[PDB]
Amino acid sequence: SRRRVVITGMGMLSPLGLDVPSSWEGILAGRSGIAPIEHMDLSAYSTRFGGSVKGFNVEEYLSAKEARKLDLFIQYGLAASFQAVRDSGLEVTDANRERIGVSMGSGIGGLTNIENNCRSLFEQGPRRISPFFVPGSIINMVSGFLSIHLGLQGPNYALTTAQTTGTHSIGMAARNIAYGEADVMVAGGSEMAACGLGLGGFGAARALSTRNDEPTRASRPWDRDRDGFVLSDGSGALVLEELEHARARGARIYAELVGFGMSGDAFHMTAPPEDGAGAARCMKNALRDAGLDPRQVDYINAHGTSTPAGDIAEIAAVKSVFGEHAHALSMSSTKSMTGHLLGAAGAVEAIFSVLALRDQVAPPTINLDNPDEGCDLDLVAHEAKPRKIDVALSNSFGFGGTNGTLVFRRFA
């Protein structure tokens, strides 16, 4: 029989902050983390801005030596993971190390380090490829390195489901606990795809905003003048824990993870169906998993990427799932502020959903000046809205038509 799963620790790097509290302060203030990119020359690119992590100091977590062997996406994932475990208060011992695992994923992974080694290969030659190229670039090395540093011997894996990664990572980790394969999991996602191939690749697909003159206004989910997503970097990690395990050690419980849904659109490689039918199936799976009446959902943290086709598909899906209740719940996209953290989006947005529960407040959709046709729900335009929130749902969708939904609830 299925065990209950709660959240006892969280950690983050985002364009708004180097930890959870600083990021969340930005969220509730409606602050943008988007700016012209400084770390490379994007003069030849159609998009020249995004959400960078500012002032990260890897040496708070790892030595210079260890850090230079690892791509930035790995460093970011480790930072968020270490923060979450610290936040949870958990002490790893021989008595529990086999019962604590890790599932930290990425969508794009080590593209940046691969691009740099590729430069070495072609400009210098093959003997300039790093000895640490493979372990420092592969997606599972967040889980790997975290387990090595903390001594975690339970299930150890990584998902890669593009922009759905972080949501799937958390949901599948919760299944491990619910079914008895672990008592504790560290789960989430990390990304740093701000390199030539990243900006260039998403740009070639015409998926990015090109509002170069006003980067903070670029990400504008459901607004009539939206023109694509804003690429952002960072990481999110949660400590998921079996309920009785948490209670026995006197852990602080932020919220309960009650539902997880998955689906496939089976429609198109890079676009959802106009009616968001796949997203609707995914949400219904998550609601049924949680044993809920859809009218119990108070807050939705949308995927809200600011693409023309994506944002309206999600409205359609929400209307299909919730009926008239779609007008009672609040739904917002925190990507309005953070931009799109790709494989880490679902992780940071899970955190934001948990914090919406702790603080009884719906984060805003900033930049929502003129809602587009049919976008007539309570989208929490401009300003955070204090309200009752007993149940929060968080959606992620990805290229390939891969969908995930998490459902969190206040714990008492």
Ligand X SMILES: C[C@]12C[C@@]34C=CC(=O)[C@@](C)(CCC(=O)Nc5c(O)ccc(C(=O)O)c5O)[C@@H]3[C@H](C[C@@H]1C4)O2
Listed residue (355, 240, 283) closest to 4, CA to CA: 240
Nearer to K ion, 242 or 349 (CB): 349
Q: Does 132 bind ligand X (CB under 6 A)?
A: no
What residues from 248 to 267 belong to the interface with its own copies (CB under 8 A)?
A: 262-267
What residues from 144 to 183 belong to the interface with its own copies (CB under 8 A)?
A: 144-145, 147-148, 150-162, 164, 168, 172, 175, 179, 181
Among 59, 60, 115, 376, binds its own copies (CB under 8 A): 115
Q: What is the C-alpha separation between 305 and 232, in angstroms, rounded?
A: 11
Q: Does 291 bind its own copies (CB under 8 A)?
A: no
Residue 114 partner contact from K ion, ligand X, its own copies, none using kind-dependent CB cut-offs of 5 to 8 Å: its own copies
> Residues of 331-341 as b/e, b for ≥16 C-beta within 10 angstroms?
bbbbbbbbbbb
Q: What is the C-alpha separation between 308 and 228, in angstroms, rounded?
A: 7
Strands 255-264 and 100-105: unpaired
Q: Does 143 bind K ion (CB under 5 A)?
A: no
Q: Does 50 bind ligand X (CB under 6 A)?
A: no
Residue 229 partner contact from its own copies, K ion, ligand X, none using kind-dependent CB cut-offs of 5 to 8 Å: ligand X
Residues 33 and 16 sit within 8 Å (Cβ to Cβ): yes
HEC string for 48-95: CEEECCCCCCHHHCCCHHHHHCCCHHHHHHHHHHHHHHHHHCCCCCCC
Residues 233 and 192 sit within 8 Å (Cβ to Cβ): yes
Residues 350 and 261 sit within 8 Å (Cβ to Cβ): no
What residues from 76 to 105 belong to the interface with its own copies (CB under 8 A)?
A: 97-98, 101-102, 105
Among 378, 399, 410, 411, binds ligand X (CB under 6 A): 399
Binding-residue pattern over the window 312 to 351 for ligand X, x denoting contact by CB under 6 A = ----------------------------x-----------
Angle at 88 between CA 84 and CA 92, to 5 degrees: 95
Nearer to its own copies, 205 or 328 (CB): 205
β partners of residue 184: 100, 241
β partners of residue 41: none
Nearer to K ion, 90 or 368 (CB): 368
Residues 264 and 283 sit within 8 Å (Cβ to Cβ): no
**Residue 193 C-beta-side C-alpha neighbours within 13 Å:** 28
Nearer to its own copies, 115 or 225 (CB): 115
Joined tokens for residue 250:
């006197």
Nearer to K ion, 182 or 380 (CB): 380
Among 170, 207, 262, 317, binds ligand X (CB under 6 A): 207
Nearer to ligand X, 121 or 309 (CB): 309
> What minimum distance in Å lies between the beta carbon of 34 and its own copies?
20
Nearer to its own copies, 33 or 198 (CB): 198
Among 3, 54, 196, 253, binds its own copies (CB under 8 A): 196
Neighbours of 203 (CB within 10 A): 18
Binding positions for K ion, rule: CB under 5 A: 301, 349, 394
Binding positions for ligand X, rule: CB under 6 A: 163, 205-207, 228-229, 270-272, 305, 307-310, 340, 397-399
